[PDB]
Design a protein around this ligand. Structure first.
Ligand SMILES: [Ca+2]
Ligand SMILES: [Ca+2]
Length: 105
């Protein structure tokens, strides 16, 4: 997986920032963000989401159906944000917003 070739709508700086955020919250260092890790992320961003909200966030981008997020799937959150596909103030909209990445730039 070369993210730089799949996600050309983002600069190298933006992808590296997304990587830093991903790695920050992958507490277990296994290369994925699972439900509890995402729960902790949203708490720390200051916008805790409900259990179902969290589950639904993962479902929106969980392209290989394993119920956790790889880095590529994490980038899909930002791709969806940038494509105008996220519902206003849904959990993923909030994640992208509160993150240091502004996909509208
Ligand atoms: Ca993990
Ligand atoms: Ca997955």
């Amino acid at each position: 997986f070369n993210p730089y070739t799949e996600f050309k709508e983002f600069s190298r700086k933006q992808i590296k920032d997304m990587e830093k955020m991903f790695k920050q919250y992958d507490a277990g260092r296994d290369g994925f963000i699972d439900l509890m890790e995402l729960k902790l992320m949203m708490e720390k961003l200051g916008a805790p989401q409900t259990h179902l909200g969290l589950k639904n966030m993962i479902k929106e981008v969980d392209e290989d159906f394993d119920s956790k997020l790889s880095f590529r799937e994490f980038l899909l959150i930002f791709r969806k944000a940038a494509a105008g596909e996220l519902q206003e103030d849904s959990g993923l909209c909030v994640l992208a917003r509160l993150s240091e990445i502004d996909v509208s730039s």
